[PDB]
Design goal:
homodimer; Retinoid X Receptor; 4 strands; binds the ligand CCCOc1ccc(C[C@H](Cc2ccccc2)C(=O)O)cc1CNC(=O)c1ccc([C@]23C[C@H]4C[C@H](C[C@H](C4)C2)C3)cc1; transcription coregulator binding (chain A); diabetes mellitus (chain A); biological rhythms (chain A); identical protein binding (chain A)
């Protein structure tokens, strides 16, 4: 039966490569040098990187924060497409699918964001740039503790040294989470996740024979993720309840 | 079912199960026996309202909510003591840096308390006073605005957690896994802790596979529940800040207060 598992794993990987442009393997090469990105480490760096480079993603801290949103909206579409390739997903009650993506994207966003971060910064805009971790903490208002929580998570998560083939199955497990509120038919979901969990388990055993109980440690990071999301939602509302320069075109705000 | 490695894991499971029974007076087996009525001597007095509560004082401050609340404070202080005792039995635990021992307990006792509290719960209520009493979920939710719902989140977790059908021998290892968490804030030497947890994780994994052959991916499902515990703790901690402000006259046990400080 270990046949259908290896196939599911290969399938998810191929699909993951297709849905996500910047893989971890590719991002890693750019972060260590073995392979250059424009560096944003201070205000003038920023102003220049967006001047020469047309970073598709008023006030700096605010403009940076909104670029994060723009990029997140973009990531949501990639994740949605990926999900549809997971065997059984499209066959679930349509409302449940929306529910699963609705509560799952944030967890996946931060999970994948770690692939693009090291302890010194994060790759932005397809990796054409590198925004410094220090510069992010240099932001005033509450925009200073905005990204820090993610870096800390990334340092820990990256310590597991997973690769794209590992992450592809993990993401699918995050998506098929049967405890999301509002699901109408939980069984099919948990049934698919169970199969995905089996696939992830064999994947990690064969890909990291020397890493003891890596499956357990990866599942434990689940705790870390939701805490990051919950905390994120809190700072997000604090930005809505306060801040008056967050004004965007009516059509734009609707887009988020 | 072979090698000396799997043999060491079974030995560890037995050691942990043996300590768990020795450290916790009210096991899940005894709790289930009382709840399911497979007795004529283990039947609890049920408290589902005020007069019941009143009549229970005889069978088993000044206010309904606060009295019930102070009771839970006392009981969990006692639980922390039992948990602390169980912790010393975990191989390697007492050999770790003394500060880390305190840190691990500080972050693990509540997650463990709610894990074990589920053993004493069903969709309708919870056992109290070593199983002599039973307070229904509805009575506890009818309480005054503040306390009126400090328990509901525990019930919601319990009915789902109990769905895994774990038994004491399973819980003994899981409780151990929880305590030996290398990602606790402020830990000095994270390596020795992770090494102990890895071995506990192996013990738990084998135990579940052997105890629940037909329960597919129980191990992973059990681990995912850990996120549920953290959440319970945060909510509870926030509900306490609310109470200590609305009820300026209600005291909170020092031990429990030192555990929430800078949590
Ligand atoms: C009432 C059911 C509640 O049963 C709970 C609920 C939550 C906890 C966890 C605590 C709550 C807390 C939250 C905030 C701070 C600290 C801890 C925690 O998280 O630390 C423990 C118990 C276990 N409780 C019992 O077994 C139990 C035994 C005796 C009584 C009486 C108290 C008093 C009135 C009645 C008659 C006498 C005198 C006995 C009932 C009540 C409860």
């Amino acid at each position: 039966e270990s046949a259908d598992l290896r196939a599911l794993a290969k399938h998810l990987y191929d699909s993951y490569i297709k849905s996500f442009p910047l893989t971890k393997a590719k991002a890693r090469a750019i972060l260590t040098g073995k392979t250059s990105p424009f560096v944003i480490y201070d205000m003038n760096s920023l102003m220049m990187g967006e001047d020469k480079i047309k970073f598709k993603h008023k006030e700096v801290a605010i403009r940076i924060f909104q670029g994060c949103q723009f990029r997140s909206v973009e990531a949501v579409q990639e994740i949605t497409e990926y999900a549809k390739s997971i065997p059984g997903f499209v066959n679930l009650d349509l409302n449940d699918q929306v529910t699963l993506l609705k509560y799952g994207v944030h967890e996946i966003i931060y999970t994948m964001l770690a692939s693009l971060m090291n302890k010194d910064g994060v790759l932005i805009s397809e990796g054409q740039g590198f925004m410094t971790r220090e510069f992010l903490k240099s932001l005033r208002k509450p925009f200073g503790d905005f990204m820090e929580p993610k870096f800390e998570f990334a340092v820990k998560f990256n310590a597991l040294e997973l690769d794209d083939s590992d992450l592809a199955i993990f993401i699918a497990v995050i998506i098929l989470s049967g405890d999301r509120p509002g699901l109408l038919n939980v069984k099919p979901i948990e049934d698919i996740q169970d199969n995905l969990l089996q696939a992830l388990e064999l994947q990690l055993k064969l890909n990291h024979p020397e890493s003891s109980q890596l499956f357990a440690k990866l599942l434990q990071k689940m705790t870390d993720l939701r805490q990051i999301v919950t905390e994120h939602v809190q700072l997000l509302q604090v930005i809505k309840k306060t801040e008056t320069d967050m004004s965007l075109h009516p059509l734009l705000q609707e887009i988020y």
